[PDB]
């Protein structure tokens, strides 16, 4: 399963770099995706909404940021 989730990981990171947000937002979302993909090591359709809501919590207040973040995780 390591190959599978690592493919997903690299894909979403590449998508993060291309996003129209400051490097701080990229930094936050990237570390969140790292944590989620390495706490797989450590309610079966809603994971796509759990992962999405965990990694994009970094936006918090601003709704704008939630937008681009979720868009990253849809594709």
């Amino acid at each position, epitope marked *: 399963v390591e190959r599978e989730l690592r493919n997903w*990981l690299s894909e979403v990171l*590449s998508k*993060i*770099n291309d996003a129209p947000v400051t*490097n*701080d937002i*990229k930094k936050a979302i*990237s570390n969140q995706v790292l944590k989620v993909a390495e706490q797989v090591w450590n309610s079966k359709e809603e994971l796509q909404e759990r992962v999405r809501k965990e990694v994009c919590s970094v936006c918090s207040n601003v709704p704008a940021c939630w937008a681009i973040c979720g868009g990253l995780l849809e594709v």
Partner: antibody
Amino acid sequence: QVTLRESGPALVKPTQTLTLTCTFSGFSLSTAGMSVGWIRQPPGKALEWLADIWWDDKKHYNPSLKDRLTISKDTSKNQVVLKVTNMDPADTATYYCARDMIFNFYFDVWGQGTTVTVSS
Amino acid sequence: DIQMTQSPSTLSASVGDRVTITCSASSRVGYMHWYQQKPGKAPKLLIYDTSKLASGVPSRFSGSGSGTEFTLTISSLQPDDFATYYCFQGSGYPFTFGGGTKVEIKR
């Protein structure tokens, strides 16, 4: 263990072109989120960021050296190459290459640095 | 752009004193990192993000701040803390360092 090492000439005559090669081990520029940047330091001056390269071949340069910087990455050989053109005598400096990550957005592991002197 | 002034530019303090260097930006910036550079050696990461010690840095080093004002502090100055400390920012291109702060030991 991450380790970078710069290489290049010790001397370039003014208006020549400087070719610096960062050779790294301990990580790869193909793996996601990775990056390598070039920071130089003139004698008795502060640090100055020049360029950086990412695993997705994205590139950024300091605007102060507009048009004179071209960075390139060769993941096969584990090398990055900065090429600075139209070398002035004020660009005499020690040039460092350092590693960067999209998680960090700061340089953690630096090379030892290579000193280049612009003179006749 | 995004540019930062450190103060003081230089400072002398006896061994054991609390010393604080202030890096102040020209824009709201997410984080502020700190590098320590010994003479004729490569810079070393001292404080990453804003308050996190890089590997090996002794507990005497603390970092703090937010928005447009940040500080690096040494609780008790050691003789081995002779260095030049540069603040660094990575939240907005181009990456910029502070002017620099030379820390000399009063003796």
